[PDB]
Design a protein around this ligand. Sequence first.
Ligand SMILES: C[n+]1cn([C@@H]2O[C@H](COP(=O)(O)OP(=O)(O)OP(=O)(O)OC[C@H]3O[C@@H](n4cnc5c(N)ncnc54)[C@H](O)[C@@H]3O)[C@@H](O)[C@H]2O)c2nc(N)[nH]c(=O)c21
Ligand SMILES: C[n+]1cn([C@@H]2O[C@H](COP(=O)(O)OP(=O)(O)O)[C@@H](O)[C@H]2O)c2nc(N)[nH]c(=O)c21
Ligand SMILES: C[S@@+](CC[C@H](N)C(=O)[O-])C[C@H]1O[C@@H](n2cnc3c(N)ncnc32)[C@H](O)[C@@H]1O
Ligand SMILES: [Zn+2]
Ligand SMILES: [Zn+2]
Lengths: 299, 115
Amino acid sequence: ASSQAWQPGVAMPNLYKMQRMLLEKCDLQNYGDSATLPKGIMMNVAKYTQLCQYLNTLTLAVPYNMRVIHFGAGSDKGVAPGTAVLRQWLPTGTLLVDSDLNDFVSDADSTLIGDCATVHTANKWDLIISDMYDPKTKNVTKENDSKEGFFTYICGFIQQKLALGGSVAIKITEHSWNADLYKLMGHFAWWTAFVTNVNASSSEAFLIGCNYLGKPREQIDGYVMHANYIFWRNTNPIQLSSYSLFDMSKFPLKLRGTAVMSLKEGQINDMILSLLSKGRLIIRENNRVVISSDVLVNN
Amino acid sequence: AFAVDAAKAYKDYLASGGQPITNCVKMLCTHTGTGQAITVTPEANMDQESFGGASCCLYCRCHIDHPNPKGFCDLKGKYVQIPTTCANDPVGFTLKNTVCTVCGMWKGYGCSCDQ
Ligand SMILES: C[n+]1cn([C@@H]2O[C@H](COP(=O)(O)OP(=O)(O)OP(=O)(O)OC[C@H]3O[C@@H](n4cnc5c(N)ncnc54)[C@H](O)[C@@H]3O)[C@@H](O)[C@H]2O)c2nc(N)[nH]c(=O)c21
Ligand SMILES: C[n+]1cn([C@@H]2O[C@H](COP(=O)(O)OP(=O)(O)O)[C@@H](O)[C@H]2O)c2nc(N)[nH]c(=O)c21
Ligand SMILES: C[S@@+](CC[C@H](N)C(=O)[O-])C[C@H]1O[C@@H](n2cnc3c(N)ncnc32)[C@H](O)[C@@H]1O
Ligand SMILES: [Zn+2]
Ligand SMILES: [Zn+2]
């Protein structure tokens, strides 16, 4: 077994991010292979556990009364395995809201059913998790182009509802991706494409934006960067592994007690951006949390 | 005076040889927990499995009103510990057993306040 088999997953190395590759078909050596999971553990429990294991190594801002929203939390089973892992991972008192196009039962404080485009919220969020995937992406009848759908909503939601210092984890695949989303990763202190070891046989990856700055730190071309992601996946086969799942002793996210300040436009100097980049600050209102779901009415 | 008694109808379905409700979400944990029945975080011990509350609630899974005047669920947002020997049907286990208000364990599967 490889050295990274004892890791929760693998992050796209910096040297692959600096290339300018053309988009090629993703052809993984182990495509289709299944990982060996612990007895009775669902795939999405193993997958979210490894994601959270990795998020524990980043400079996440973790304040009291933390606000997390989880899109694409439903499943064909009618339950939310990922929301269950997040509830386990987040500190007690953390507000957790989940949503999906289809009806499902969740351990979240509040669940919204409907297209994510019909979800509205008055307040900002500290962390955004998206596991959304349109099944129609499986019908590849033309060139792999940047997708619209929920990605259009997600890009608008990050720019208007993510607190500065906040972080994101958005799920993508070879064909389920968006160029504007990669461009936004440049608006964070740091970013990467993370692959869980239990699903290394899939082109799936979680784009991770760490510490939102509300302004571009670097200029990123989404078409070029997605090609870079594919080149990395094609040239680096990753060994399937569930080893990280057997040690759950350091799993829970530590409550850093990150400061929450309601600073305005024009009070963001360099020292503030420096504290945002290290997860020592969250900028947003601390008002009551209000969410709603539009209901279209026909005959 | 009518009301759907789903708890009873399910036992009559289990005695009828029916298939237990599946897709209960088992959690990964150290198995070094308190052993308490319903906790805010997985507390399974070496003889139990931790599950997400909502997935083990009959009322939540069947989309029907809870047996509480307000409609409040005591499993949703929490974790239920189920003995490894009965983990093939967590919903049925939570319906047939009760929790000790003194030590917070399952009566007959952890509780020993009679000693
Ligand atoms: C990466 N890849 C893609 N394809 C082909 O391109 C199509 C679209 O590619 P994709 O963008 O869906 O990527 P990939 O196949 O890696 O996705 P995968 O099936 O692993 O699904 C990724 C995740 O998306 C979600 N998902 C997948 N399908 C659905 C669905 N129907 N409904 C809901 N969620 C879904 C799940 O969370 C799942 O783990 C595939 O269906 C396949 O024919 C490949 N073919 C070969 N031979 N080798 C490859 O390496 C390869
Ligand atoms: C994991 N991580 C990486 N960086 C930045 O990327 C650099 C390289 O980090 P790395 O690529 O993870 O490799 P390393 O093991 O040598 O640290 C760091 O020194 C930071 O500048 C990070 N920057 C922030 N703000 N937060 C993170 O979580 C983070
Ligand atoms: C991979 S499944 C989510 C699995 C879930 N994270 C779990 O823990 O098992 C992807 C989900 O995205 C949802 N989805 C797809 N398009 C959506 C949209 N436009 N709005 C909301 N949800 C959407 C689907 O209903 C589907 O349940
Ligand atoms: Zn319930
Ligand atoms: Zn007792």
